[PDB]
């Protein structure tokens, strides 16, 4: 039977329908951001994923040590050898 | 409660159940996504040190601001 809700009630009914729709749209957008099918499905873009995260950042990390940390390690090794030579000289004196 | 009113209640409750489960899904997905970004921040935090301590080659605009 045709359900004679109040006209205000009917309007707010269409409004909840609209809210359901754009909530589904937002869900679809968030999924698209979280899709793992970047360039696997028909597409050419990328999504936030290991392609951009640790699998991509560890790619940078395993090589960045060559310029940044190994350089400091070199002079630290020099300083270690120097204090070793110093304590050897002290032992020779003592 | 009128039959029209009652039907509106049960329809309303059904769509509340749908909204509740869909919000639960959205919350879980966003939790995972933000955790992934937190992991990205954690792995990248170590790059600031090398950036600042390597600046001494050439900075340009920062050197200009120092010189301005």
């Amino acid at each position: 039977m045709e359900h004679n809700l109040s006209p205000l009630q009917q309007e707010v009914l269409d409004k909840y329908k609209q809210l359901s729709l754009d909530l589904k749209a937002l869900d679809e957008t968030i999924k698209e951001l979280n899709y793992s099918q970047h360039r696997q499905q028909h597409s050419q873009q990328e999504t936030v994923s290991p392609d951009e995260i640790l699998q991509e950042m560890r790619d940078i990390e395993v090589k960045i040590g060559l310029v940044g940390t190994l350089l400091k390690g070199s002079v630290y090794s020099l300083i270690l050898q120097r204090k070793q030579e110093q304590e050897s000289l002290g032992s020779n004196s003592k | 409660i009128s039959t029209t009113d009652k039907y509106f209640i049960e329809q309303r409750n059904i769509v509340l159940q749908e909204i509740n489960e869909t919000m639960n899904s959205i919350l879980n997905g966003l939790n995972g996504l933000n955790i992934s970004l937190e992991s990205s921040i954690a792995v990248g935090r170590e790059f600031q040190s090398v950036s600042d301590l390597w600046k001494t080659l050439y900075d340009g605009l920062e050197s200009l601001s120092d010189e301005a």
Binding site: L71, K72, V75, Y76, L78, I79 | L53, T56, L57
Partner: peptide
């Protein structure tokens, strides 16, 4: 040798800035 140590001073100042040598 002075020209040696002069030409490589940019490396020296880099290594000093981060190693506090």
């Amino acid at each position: 040798c002075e020209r040696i140590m002069d030409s490589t001073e940019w490396l020296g100042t880099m290594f000093q800035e981060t190693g506090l040598v």
